[PDB]
Amino acid sequence: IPAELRPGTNQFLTTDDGTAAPILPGFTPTPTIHIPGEVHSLLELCRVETILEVNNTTEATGLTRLLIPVSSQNKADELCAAFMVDPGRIGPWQSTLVGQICRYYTQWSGSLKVTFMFTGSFMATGKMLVAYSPPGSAQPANRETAMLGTHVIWDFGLQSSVSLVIPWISNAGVVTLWYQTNYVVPPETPGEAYIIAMGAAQDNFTLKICKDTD
């Protein structure tokens, strides 16, 4: 039969589909068994709430950078902590599981959520104003100009944890938290506690073109 050779044959494409010849024909491999915990796609990995570094100052040096301090002498409406919502930029998200698998996959889009929890005594009681701003502006200044946004008045005597759904990032957006009340202790009780943060991605978090890391 006649045949021609179009340009592009004698080449090695480095991303190809045609199988080579097997070097050991007739070899039957050892058959698999039911090992529990099989991962089909790595989208299931980035839906795991992992610990978020916030106190990434110079003098942190250890496990103390995994936690946000809460005093008992702070006057009302003074910012406790603040960080950008940026899965991939050099900062707080660089320690979580989202922030590592988004150094791959150049373009991302989705809906991240942020979870806090509290680590004080049972007798303590306070409130927090977890705020949020769209990426148009910078962080607010006062408690009043932060109150008008997407606040969640989270207190301590009832709930020990709270979440917050951030809608539709792409390739900033700033979250803060304000005191909004005093931190109240009974006597013979240590008056310091810490709030560790979390981080995860919800269902519509998609990725695009692959890219090597670091």
Binding site: I23, F27, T32, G37, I68, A81, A82, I90, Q94, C210
Partner: protein, 201 residues
């Protein structure tokens, strides 16, 4: 999609770089833990299972009948270019001329256990965490002539992973490592770069 685990491994990157002088031959153990771009993507998981295919690219500095042997795990490695291991028919070898487009061959899954283990906590009875069931063999590149080759040739070995299936995950490595096959880290670097204060995002 392109976030499935098969597409995440389906690029054919460089593994090892092998050059030979004329000694006369050059061997190369099979191991994927050669470069840091593939080790950080394969200490992700604990149990893996995959077939692999290769490609040998040859850069002189005409064609010769150089061969590429293959050693299944257990067979003895060649000691000289004119030893008797080059003619054992149980070692599958591939004769390829230089000027031809590059060679390509597949390797099936040879480990005795159901999947490869990248972390073993035990002993075979310094012998801590050396599972012998990860051996995949060598290649032992040899130029074929009767005498006096005189090429000074350098080959490159590429690797594509196919049909891969992964089990239970682990978190990624965050520090550089000293030794080749051990997680020793010489205690410390951080994970996130610092900023000025806790305020002022």
């Amino acid at each position: 999609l392109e976030t499935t685990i098969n597409h995440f491994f389906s690029r054919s990157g460089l593994v090892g770089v092998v050059n030979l002088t004329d000694t006369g031959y050059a061997t190369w153990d099979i191991d994927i833990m050669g470069f840091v771009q593939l080790r950080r993507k394969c200490e992700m998981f604990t149990y893996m299972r995959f077939n692999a295919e290769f490609t040998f690219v040859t850069t002189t500095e005409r064609p010769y009948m150089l061969q590429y042997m293959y050693v299944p795990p257990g067979a003895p490695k060649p000691t000289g270019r004119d030893a008797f291991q080059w003619q054992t028919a149980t070692n599958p070898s591939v004769f390829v001329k230089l000027t031809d487009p590059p060679a390509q061959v597949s390797v099936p899954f040879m480990s005795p256990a159901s999947a490869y283990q990248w972390f073993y906590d035990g002993y075979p009875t310094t012998t801590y965490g050396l599972c012998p069931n990860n051996m995949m063999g060598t290649f032992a590149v040899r130029v074929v002539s009767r005498e006096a080759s005189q090429l000074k040739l350098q080959t490159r070995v590429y690797m594509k992973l196919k049909h891969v299936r992964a089990w239970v995950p682990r978190p990624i490595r965050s520090q550089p490592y000293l030794l080749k096959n051990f997680p020793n880290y010489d205690s410390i670097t951080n994970s996130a770069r610092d900023r000025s204060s806790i305020k002022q995002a």
